[PDB]
Structure 1
Amino acid sequence: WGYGKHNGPEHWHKDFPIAKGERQSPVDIDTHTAKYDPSLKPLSVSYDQATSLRILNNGHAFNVEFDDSQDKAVLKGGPLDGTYRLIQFHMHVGSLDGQGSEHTVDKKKYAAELHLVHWNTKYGDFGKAVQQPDGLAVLGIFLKVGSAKPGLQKVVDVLDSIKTKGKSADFTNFDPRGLLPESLDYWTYPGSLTTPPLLECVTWIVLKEPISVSSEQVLKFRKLNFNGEGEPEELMVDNWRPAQPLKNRQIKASFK
C-alpha cells in the first residue's frame, strides 16, 4: 500500500475490506451541521513530562515515537473516558499549499495535518487497544502557511537524517506542547486510523484552530522520500487519504 495510482487509497479495500466500513476517517466537517454539545468537558492535555525517543521515516510519513511505559504525556477529558497515553505523532502534507490535510472543514483543505496518537491505558498496551472500539484517541491539528512555528523547527532541522524509508534518528527531549494552538476547542466523532489497517478504534479530536508554519518550514517537510536509499526518488508528498462518508455518525463541537 501507498499513495500512488497503483496502491493508493482507492486500492486499499482489496487488502483491508474495512476501508469500506461504517466509521472510516477522515471525514469532512460541515460546521453548520455539527452539534454543539455542552456536556463535553474541556480537553486535558498533560505533556509536561513527555519523553520522545526517536524520529523515523517509515516510507509513509515521518513519526516521532515517545516512551509510553508510564503516564508521562497523557490526554484526558473532552469526550474521553480514561487516560490515553501519547505513543507517537506524524504528519500528512500536500504537494501544494491548498492540499495536505485529511480532515476538511466545509470542504476546505489545509496545507498539512499533524496526528498525535494516544492509546487507552485500561487496555495495557497499544496492541490490545486496537482491538477495542474505544482503544485510541487521535488529536488532529491543521497547519496553514504563515509565520514560523519555533516548536516545529527542531523536527525540521533533523529531517536530513531520515530522508529515506527505514532511516531513524535519536530524537530525545522534544516537547510536544510546542505543537499546540492557543485554543483547545475541538470537534469530535468516532472514526478510524486513516492508513492501513484502518481499524475503527479511534475517537477523533480535531482542533478548530490551526497552527502556522513558514513557507520555508513546509518546504522542508516536502523534501522527504517514500523510497528507500538507492531507489528512484519519490518525494513524500500528498500522503493523505480523501474524506470518507460520515454515514450514521454525528460530529460534536465543544464550542458555539
Structure 2
Amino acid sequence: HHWGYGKHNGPEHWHKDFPIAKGERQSPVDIDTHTAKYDPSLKPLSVSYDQATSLRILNNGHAFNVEFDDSQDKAVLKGGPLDGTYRLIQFHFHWGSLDGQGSEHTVDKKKYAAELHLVHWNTKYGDFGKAVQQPDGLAVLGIFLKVGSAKPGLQKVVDVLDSIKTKGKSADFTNFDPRGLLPESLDYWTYPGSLTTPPLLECVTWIVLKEPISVSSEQVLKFRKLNFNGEGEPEELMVDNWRPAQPLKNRQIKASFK
C-alpha cells in the first residue's frame, strides 16, 4: 500500500520500503539554535528567481507541486554553503491540520504552521535524475510559515487549489513569481540531509531561513481543503503531510548569522 501520512502508511512505516529512512543524513531535523555554529566561511546566499518560468501545478496525492521549466539557467540558487549553481525545479509545502503543527524542521522544538521547500538540482549533473544519484545533487531552500497577515505572493497559489482538489489533477500555472514567497532576511541554517518524502534520498544541502513568512488563516485553511484521495473517492483531507524530526546523528548545523 502506497506511502502516505496516515496511521498505516505514514512516516513510521516508510523504512520497510525505503530502508534509507533510518540512514545517516535524514531530514527533517530539529534546529537547536544554541548549538548551531555561526560559520564565517559561508558566502552570502544568492537567490535569483527573476527569470523563473512556472509551468504547472499538480496535486500528487501527498502535497501539490508547482513545477518550473528547468531546461535553462533561469531560477537559480548559488552561494552560501553551495558550490556551483543549483536550478529550481519545483516547490511544494507541508502543513498541519491545526496552526500549531505542520513544519518539518523545527526550531528549538518549535513547530511552525507549515513549511515551503523550493527544490533545486546541481547543474553539474545535467538533470534532476542524475543529480539525485549524487551526495551534493540537490539544494532545498526551506521557509517556515506562521499564521498572521496574508502573504500576497501566495494568493495565486491559494486561488488555483480549487481546480486541483484531488490526487492526479493538475492546472496550468504559468508566470508565477516565486520571489513573492520569500521573507525579507536571507539569514539561514544549513546542514546535509535528504528529501523528506520517499524515496528519502540523501542528496540535499538544506538551507532553512530563520525568518518565517506570515500567511493568513484563510490562506492555510484553503491548503487544508485539498484531498489526498482521487476524484470520486471518499474524502481524506490533505493535512499533516509532514515528516517529524529525525536523528541528527553525526551532523553539525551551521548558521549564516551571528
Same fold (TM over 0.5): yes
Q: Separation in 2 of the partners of 1:169 and 1:93?
A: 21
Shift in Å, 1:45: 0.5
d(CA) in 2 for partners of 1:214, 1:27? 26
Any idea what SS the aligned residue of 1:18 has?
helix
SS at structure 1 position matched to 2:162 = coil
Which residue number corresponds to residue 141 of structure 2?
139
CA distance in 1, matches of 2:117, 2:71: 20
Q: For residues 111-163 of structure 1, what are the alpha-carbon distances to aligned partners after superposition, in whole Å with 9 as ceiling and x for unaligned?
A: 00000000000000100000000000000000000101000000001000000
Deviation sequence 1:177-229 (CA, Å, 0-9, x none): 00000000000000000000000000000000000001111110111000000
Alpha-carbon separation, structure 1, partners of 2:37 and 2:87: 27
**Alpha-carbon distance in 2 for matches of 1:73, 1:54:** 15
- The counterpart of 1:126, out of the listed 128, 132, 139, is 128
Q: Alignment partner of 1:216: what SS?
A: helix
CA RMSD of aligned residues (A): 0.3
CA distance in 2, matches of 1:241, 1:56: 20
Q: SS of the counterpart of 2:214?
A: strand
Residues 1:8 and 2:10 aligned together: yes
CA distance in 1, matches of 2:34, 2:184: 23
Select 1:27's aligned residue among 29, 54, 78.
Answer: 29
Offset, 1:59: 0.2
> Secondary structure of the residue that 2:115 maps to in structure 1?
strand
| C-alpha separation in 1, matches of 2:95 and 2:106 | 13
Cα distance between partner residues in 2 of 1:42 and 1:181: 16
Q: Could you report, residue by residue, the CA deviation over 1:69-125 in whole angstroms, capped at 9, with x for unpaired residues?
A: 000000000000010000000000100100000000000000000000000000001
SS at match of 2:163: coil
Question: Normalized against structure 1, the TM-score is what?
Answer: 1.00
Which residue does 1:231 correspond to in 2?
233
Deviations 1:28-70 (A, max 9, x none): 0000000110110110000010000000100000110000000
Rounded to whole Å, the distance in 2 between the matches of 1:156 and 1:245 is 33
Report the Cα distance in structure 2 between the residues aligned to 1:241 and 1:49, rounded to whole angstroms: 32
- In 2, Cα distance between equivalents of 1:115 and 1:190: 15
SS in 1 for 2:51: coil
Alignment of 1:101-180 (within 5 A): 101-180=103-182
Whole-angstrom CA distance in 1 between matches of 2:4 and 2:133: 24
In structure 1, what is the Cα distance between the partners aligned to 2:244 and 2:176? 30
Secondary structure in 1 aligned to 2:77?
strand
Which runs of 4 or more aligned residues in structure 1 lie more than 6 Å from their structure 2 counterparts after TM superposition? none
Mapped partners of 1:11, 1:164: distance in 2: 24
Taking every aligned residue pair, what percent have the same amino acid on both sides?
Answer: 99
Q: Which residue of 2 aligns with 1:242?
A: 244
| Structure 2 counterpart SS, 1:10 | coil
Q: Which whole-Å CA distance do the structure 2 matches of 1:214 and 1:65 have between them? A: 24
